[PDB]
Symmetry: C3
Subunit: 224 residues, 3 copies
Amino acid sequence: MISILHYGYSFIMLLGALYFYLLSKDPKGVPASEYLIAMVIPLWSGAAYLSIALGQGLFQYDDTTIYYARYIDWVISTPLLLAALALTAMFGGKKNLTLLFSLVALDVFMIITGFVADLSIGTTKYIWYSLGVIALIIILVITFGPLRRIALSNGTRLARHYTRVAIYLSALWVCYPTAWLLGPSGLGLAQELTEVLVFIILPIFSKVGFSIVDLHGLRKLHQS
Amino acid sequence: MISILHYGYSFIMLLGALYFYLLSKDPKGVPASEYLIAMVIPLWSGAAYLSIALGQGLFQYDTTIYYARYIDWVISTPLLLAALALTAMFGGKKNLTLLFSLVALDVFMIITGFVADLSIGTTKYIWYSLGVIALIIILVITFGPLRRIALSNGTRLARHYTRVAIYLSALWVCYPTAWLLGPSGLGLAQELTEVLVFIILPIFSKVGFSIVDLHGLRKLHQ
Amino acid sequence: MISILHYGYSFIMLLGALYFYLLSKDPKGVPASEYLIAMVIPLWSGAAYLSIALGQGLFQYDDTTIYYARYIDWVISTPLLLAALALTAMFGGKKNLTLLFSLVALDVFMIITGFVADLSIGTTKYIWYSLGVIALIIILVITFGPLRRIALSNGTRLARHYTRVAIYLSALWVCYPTAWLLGPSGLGLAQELTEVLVFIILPIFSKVGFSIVDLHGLRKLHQS
Ligand SMILES: CCCCCCCC/C=C/CCCCCCCC(=O)O
Ligand SMILES: CCCCCCCC/C=C/CCCCCCCC(=O)O
Ligand SMILES: CCCCCCCC/C=C/CCCCCCCC(=O)O
Ligand SMILES: CCCCCCCC/C=C\CCCCCCCC(=O)O
Ligand SMILES: CCCCCCCCCCCCCCCCCCCC
């Protein structure tokens, strides 16, 4: 069942990427860079999850299955999602690439702490997990603080769209460390199959859902 | 013999890089970034192939995986496509989105090759096929939208671009062909033959390409 | 012993990063990108050395301890330090990102040769070490040649500051390959504890000391 779920996920990622490609052909004032980012996120994730479907992207460690292909996925897809969010805030204004790369750095560190925590046991595991959670808190502080202030500097209509996708992204993102802690990588309260379903459904919304809402909202700002 | 071929390769890469450095000192209207890219490609490849010469950049899996080849290509091949894109854009506005589209496709392509090499049976050919699909899209971009940019930069630039695009594309299709025929794939081609192909092809891909590319761009100065 | 030194190192990196953050809030004409770089260097190094403190970032090879987390640290922190130095040379002037990325490329290669040399034995070890030393020599030639000429083009006061931080960086940097060759990774003349103390004290000056001197000097060019 786990294999079939991963095949299905990869198929949905492909469909999402094809949809964003089709939107890119009639871009409605959204820069090409934002369509490229929107396409890479699901295609990379789809490839990583295909490796799990094929029985390759996992190994046995600490009497648990480490789905290491999830970290290979997230270390590329998640910094790209924050790049997408930052570029939304900066729509119609001067780009702040310092703030954008601040988020990329925090995010890559966050994913690495997750991988190291998964390979760790006892107190060491929760030290790495906690550092990752601290990185996520700083990402959320930037998202609702200085980055939202950039969105507000780009006017009422853009700031409304930004706030919507910031809440969409943030709601989904806090679910990942929650599921991690509850599942076999952490306290082992949630069953492996349950964790697998959560890390199938969440990313469908994080990777395809997010960019449908984001791109549609930006395209709507276009005065045709 | 395999060790000696790799030492010789590394020496040729070094000579190519030194030649591109010498050209960089009298640049004839070619931006410094294009000389840097032209130098990094062979120096990185030379270092990777040196590891094979020293007997380090390979492991047994029941055949030899020359993993240092993937460490080489994952850096050198995206840089080659960056060089090709910047040639198309010579004298005009840059399209960094198209450039990074090629970089993304190319890094994915090399990764599928590495995963395919570590894979067995149907799984191997699934990864190989995804890499081939990435290469086809790279070629579609190369002869489609990227060539259109070259044409927008005038007849003489477009002629040079078309020449180096065919040069790069002809060599690039050889890599997956050799991979499939050799011990990583169907095992029809002998290991020593595959080794020679993955010595001679890259000499043309990495040094040959940038000799033709830089000479052509420098000639546009007059 | 070695664990405690690494915990202490990580704490100093954290304090350094917090100081650079506080300076960033009253930036005195120094671009935000230069504060971000100054903060990432110690935070990354701190995390890498924390892994050694926890007994994770090392393994046994050729009867010796390979502190591989040092290379994970340097492969990110050292290119960022050269980026910081290049941006100092370019202060108040046109950026030369080609020269900056030339240094990044040389530097990443240098650290990789160090790691490969550490995993190598006999003549092979010293071939990789020598390639690393050649990369460092080219970095120093760029630093005191073309990069210094950029600094001179940005006026007397900037060029004086650049020359000071360039000599500071270069004096510390030549110590790393020297300690490597003398310690267990090389000729094995110095004890493991001696090498550990050098690769604790040097980086405190290379990562925190350097950016105190750099940022203070740049902030001083500000007319209040
Ligand atoms: C361990 C592996 C770590 C890999 C990290 C990879 C991170 C990739 C993300 C990069 C996002 C950069 C996007 C920049 C957008 C440019 C802005 C513009 O379009 O003008
Ligand atoms: C693991 C995969 C990492 C691959 C990284 C390799 C680097 C490839 C990227 C090249 C981009 C080059 C961009 C040059 C822009 C020049 C612009 C100008 O000079 O005006
Ligand atoms: C192993 C991979 C190595 C990773 C390298 C990480 C660091 C790369 C260096 C980047 C420095 C960024 C410099 C940007 C200059 C900004 C100035 C400007 O353009 O205004
Ligand atoms: C594996 C990497 C771990 C984390 C390191 C990430 C490196 C990126 C962070 C900082 C580099 C600074 C680059 C951004 C400056 C751009 C400013 C500008 O151009 O205006
Ligand atoms: C403000 C809205 C934020 C989210 C937008 C999209 C909606 C996503 C809803 C969450 C998806 C479900 C995740 C948990 C699934 C649990 C399945 C368990 C099966 C045993």
